[PDB]
């Protein structure tokens, strides 16, 4: 009611660079090219979300419906600017995302959560808990799959479901 | 017939790093994270292809079916190792890709070709020519959409079709 609440929308291609800058300043996230973020704004925007505060992007979530089993939504990246941690933005993006019309008929959410990303661990398990949906945590990608120089963590798989996301 | 022909297959998640290294050595391509290439091997592998020669990855093409209009296949990256230019690998990946069962019922191919990427300009317009399919070249992403520091070219849109890709 005073122009300082966080607002949520689908991205567009022209957001790509501002999304890229958010992911870049996070430091801790796996940065894709600016082009990749434009394509997500262009072709995957039905299953992605941006959070903004006072003209700045402060949050992003990317996801897609799995091409082979489109009842599975894969959540790719969740980012929240440093300056806006601990305000429920991640939970609000995820919740908003699942209420999008393009998530109709999703029965499982899959994602990968780095050991160090404790906020996401809480977001996904918390989501499932709150809606009383089963959750399963298993081996995802191991550290050793990543390039020799790099020093990447494991990416354990989190599966939420089965449930039925009705529109 | 002598173990030195180039071979073509769908990638898998565990190819992600070797794909990333190919894209990285290309220099000229927009490098995504290793994770992105793993996800393409994992979830989009039905519409992607790897080319190998003597145990080394020498080619990659990534593509996906557009979520909003799945009769459109978007071709994201086409890469051919420096050491294997001018051998028809790109044309063979593209041709192989379009013969995959997951490309059934595609009616349009969309992609973006950098002004400097003259091999891709030839690949896509050549493909359309050879199959007698219409092609259309229009404004895609402008240079100015890209991040301030970076020095990226335009990404003009190439649309091939309508046609009917029958299995
Ligand atoms: C759910 C989440 O936080 N997924 C993404 C992890 C991945 N390593 C990335 O940020 O690309
Ligand atoms: C068709 C092609 O060569 N597309 C990709 C261009 C893009 N800038 C990239 O390589 O990510």
TrEMBL record, chains A, B:
Q: State the top-level EC class.
A: transferase
Q: Does the keyword Transferase apply?
A: yes
EC number(s) of the enzyme?
2.3.1.178
Full protein name: L-2,4-diaminobutyric acid acetyltransferase
- The residues that hold CoA are 78, 80, 86, 88, 90-91, 117, 122
Source species, domain of life = Bacteria
* Alphabetical keyword list: Acyltransferase, Transferase
């Amino acid at each position: 009611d005073t122009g300082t609440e966080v607002v949520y929308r689908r991205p567009e291609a022209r957001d790509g660079t501002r999304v890229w800058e958010l992911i870049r300043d996070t430091g801790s996230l796996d940065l894709n090219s600016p082009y990749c973020y434009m394509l997500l704004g262009d072709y995957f925007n039905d299953t992605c979300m941006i959070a903004e505060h006072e003209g700045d992007i402060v949050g992003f979530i990317s996801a897609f419906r799995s091409p082979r089993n489109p009842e599975t939504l894969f959540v790719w990246q969740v980012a929240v600017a440093s300056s806006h941690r601990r305000q429920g933005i991640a939970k609000a993006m995820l919740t908003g995302l699942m209420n999008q019309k393009a998530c109709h008929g999703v029965r499982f959410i899959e994602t990968t959560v780095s050991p160090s990303n404790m906020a996401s661990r809480r977001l996904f398990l918390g989501y499932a808990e709150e809606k009383s949906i089963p959750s399963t945590v298993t081996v995802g990608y191991g550290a050793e799959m990543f390039p020799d120089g790099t020093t990447h963590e494991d990416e354990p798989l989190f599966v939420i479901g089965p449930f039925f996301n009705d529109i």
